[PDB]
Write a protein that binds this ligand. Sequence first.
Ligand SMILES: O=C(NO)c1cccc(-c2cn(CSc3ccccc3)nn2)c1
Ligand SMILES: [K+]
Ligand SMILES: [K+]
Ligand SMILES: [Zn+2]
Length: 400
Amino acid sequence: SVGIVYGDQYRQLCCSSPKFGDRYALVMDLINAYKLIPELSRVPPLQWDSPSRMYEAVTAFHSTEYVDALKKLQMLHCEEKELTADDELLMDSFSLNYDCPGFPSVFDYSLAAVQGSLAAASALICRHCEVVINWGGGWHHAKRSEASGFCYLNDIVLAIHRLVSSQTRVLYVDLDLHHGDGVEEAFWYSPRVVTFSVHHASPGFFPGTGTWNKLPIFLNGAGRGRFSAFNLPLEEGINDLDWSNAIGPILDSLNIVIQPSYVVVQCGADCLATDPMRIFRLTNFYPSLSGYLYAIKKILSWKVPTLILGGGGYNFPDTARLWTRVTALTIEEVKGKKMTISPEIPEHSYFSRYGPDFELDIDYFPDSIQKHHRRILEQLRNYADLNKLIYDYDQVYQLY
Ligand SMILES: O=C(NO)c1cccc(-c2cn(CSc3ccccc3)nn2)c1
Ligand SMILES: [K+]
Ligand SMILES: [K+]
Ligand SMILES: [Zn+2]
């Protein structure tokens, strides 16, 4: 069975931020308009019995003083008065500024994604769900004591920590246009959480990591975590087929060698050709085959309990078009039951947002990688030697 995180308060909170507006509502309302919701188990966001218990849960990763600052920032924005000079400095010391400014529900907003992704992890753990989807989650840039790139709390790190604390290994697959730096950093010394981000990287492009660091090299973990952080940076303009061929053997190799207890997928939609980022040229096409659908179906064929999370996506109706299809694909791959998605957007509350033509398909007409494959294959060998893992080196070598 397949779970999905939602709830009336949750929706309202996920829709309160200035950057993402009502995107989460478009997503869930298109999933509902396509009659996918009777197929899905609703997973409610986690709630706590005390302030101390919520605090304990968030400070499994974030610092107490950072959580204090984020909660004070919300309070400060629930009043009319400007911030004082001392409070401006306090917020600045946590990067609670720039692309992560305050607003009246910033703490509740950030916490909501944490509640969602922790209940999604718990559902996988008690085996209630084989796969769980949280399109209100996936905020991979937040750090221990630092907000970054619209991310204030790192719900993914907290979810992954709850999975490993239940020998357990987690594979994290980050499909966002941007390097998943917060999650990579959090598990930099941990062999039990292998992280893999594919992304655009180029000079000046946010956040700047996930690429070359004497000829330059890739850092890939430290201490017992050495070789446990994987990265594949790609050039702008890549299409579905080339991106699919680029990540396919890496994904298959990671599964064979690591044999994960769980997979966590960040499924940011800003690689889409129609995203205002306009960097990659992926689609939501399902006959070109969507790079996203290819990767998700491949991960699901492994039959490992899987958390599927949102992330970037700044063309809100096209993010909804993609994630609706990811959601139908998951139901199909898990229940064994075919889903039939009409190519035309069904009438519903946000139907006008899908003009001028109202189709499910997005409105688009479509050797470095080989060196990267040899580097990654060797890193996987090193990881597997360091961590005393058995594996047929010629079974993995033929995947490429
Ligand atoms: O997705 C991300 N990280 O995973 C990420 C991180 C940092 C910056 C950006 C970003 C997005 N845009 C598009 S403009 C826009 C359009 C709608 C809403 C909000 C912004 N400009 N900068 C994205
Ligand atoms: K990524
Ligand atoms: K790691
Ligand atoms: Zn992104």
